[PDB]
Amino acid sequence: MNIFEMLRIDEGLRLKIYKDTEGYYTAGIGHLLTKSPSLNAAKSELDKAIGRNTNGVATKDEAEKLFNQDVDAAVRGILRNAKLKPVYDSLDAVRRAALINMVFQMGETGVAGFTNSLRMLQQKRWDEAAVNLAKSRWYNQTPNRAKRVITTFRTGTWDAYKNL
Ligand SMILES: [Cl-]
Ligand SMILES: [Cl-]
């Protein structure tokens, strides 16, 4: 197991433009296209991202390429964020993947907002952080996914993803 596999399980893969859990136009492996209510605006963002007239449909290879870029950007966003960097640096490899997953899903800003949990993770107070992480809209809106990530932070193993 690794970050790619982990996110591929959490996000799935869809070649046509679809609406995510929040109703936003997305494509491929969780690649958010726009928060605008306009399908055309979405088609437009997809073409600009891929570099061709897609007509709202990507190929597998294109999706995978977007995915690689997105993971890369998530990591780099973490390393450049003064509140995130220090946490990431203190964590072991498995837990780091947990933090990347959250950033990919909610953006650097969103995650940096979990002040209390971040402090707990930095201090290595696993059970406590897990409880605090769960008191969030994130957990209430996407509980199955949130549980997988939280277990990952709690245990430091890939147990929640083995079976998937
Ligand atoms: Cl892009
Ligand atoms: Cl979920």
Side-chain angles (χ1 to χ4, degrees):
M1 179 79 50
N2 61 60
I3 187 59
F4 292 89
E5 289 183 7
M6 184 198 208
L7 276 164
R8 167 86 178 56
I9 279 153
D10 283 330
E11 297 289 353
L13 164 68
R14 297 183 58 187
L15 300 186
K16 169 73 218 234
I17 291 182
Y18 61 94
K19 290 202 200 175
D20 76 1
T21 71
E22 319 277 332
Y24 307 127
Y25 283 123
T26 299
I29 297 156
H31 184 79
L32 166 69
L33 289 169
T34 182
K35 296 174 162 167
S36 130
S38 175
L39 180 60
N40 281 359
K43 271 150 157 246
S44 184
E45 287 297 317
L46 185 62
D47 296 336
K48 158 159 81 67
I50 288 177
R52 86 188 162 76
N53 241 85
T54 69
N55 190 32
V57 180
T59 66
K60 186 128 165 148
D61 290 354
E62 280 163 356
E64 272 165 6
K65 183 145 171 213
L66 294 186
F67 185 41
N68 281 310
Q69 291 171 173
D70 290 340
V71 172
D72 197 15
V75 179
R76 296 178 84 3
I78 281 165
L79 302 169
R80 302 194 250 97
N81 184 295
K83 293 108 105 208
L84 293 181
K85 185 178 191 294
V87 177
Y88 184 83
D89 280 349
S90 74
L91 295 168
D92 57 272
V94 181
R95 296 184 172 87
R96 282 181 190 174
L99 190 64
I100 300 171
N101 192 307
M102 287 180 74
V103 171
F104 185 101
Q105 180 186 8
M106 62 197 116
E108 140 191 18
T109 305
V111 184
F114 281 63
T115 303
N116 304 315
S117 302
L118 295 171
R119 180 179 101 261
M120 279 161 204
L121 286 175
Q122 195 163 339
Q123 297 184 92
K124 309 202 179 290
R125 292 177 150 54
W126 321 119
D127 290 16
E128 293 149 64
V131 165
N132 187 264
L133 280 163
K135 304 190 198 155
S136 54
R137 174 178 192 272
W138 169 60
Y139 177 84
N140 285 101
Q141 297 304 133
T142 46
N144 291 340
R145 188 197 179 142
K147 286 179 204 234
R148 290 192 290 274
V149 174
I150 290 170
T151 295
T152 301
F153 274 131
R154 204 176 43 77
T155 66
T157 66
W158 293 112
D159 296 345
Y161 284 90
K162 299 177 196 278
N163 276 334
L164 317 199

